[PDB]
Amino acid sequence: XKXX
Amino acid sequence: XXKXX
Amino acid sequence: XXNXXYX
Amino acid sequence: XXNXXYX
Numbered sequence: 830x831k832x833x
Numbered sequence: 834x835x836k837x838x
Numbered sequence: 839x840x841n842x843x844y845x
Numbered sequence: 846x847x848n849x850x851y852x
């Protein structure tokens with residue numbers, strides 16, 4: 830599986 | 834690639 | 839977004 | 846490594  | 838890793 | 843991760 | 850980023 831998070832992030833982006 | 835590779836500023837992180 | 840624009841940041842990265844991973845969380 | 847193994848984490849992410851970006852810094």
Ligand SMILES: *[C@H]1C[C@](C)(N)C(O)(O)[C@H](C)O1
Nearest residue numbers: 830831844845847848849
């Ligand atoms: C990105 C890399 C990481 C921080 N090692 C993780 O596997 O724990 C996370 C789920 O994804």
Ligand SMILES: *[C@H]1C[C@](C)(N)C(O)(O)[C@H](C)O1
Nearest residue numbers: 836840841842850851852
């Ligand atoms: C990864 C994405 C980012 C945080 N926006 C950045 O461009 O500043 C960094 C250098 O690479």
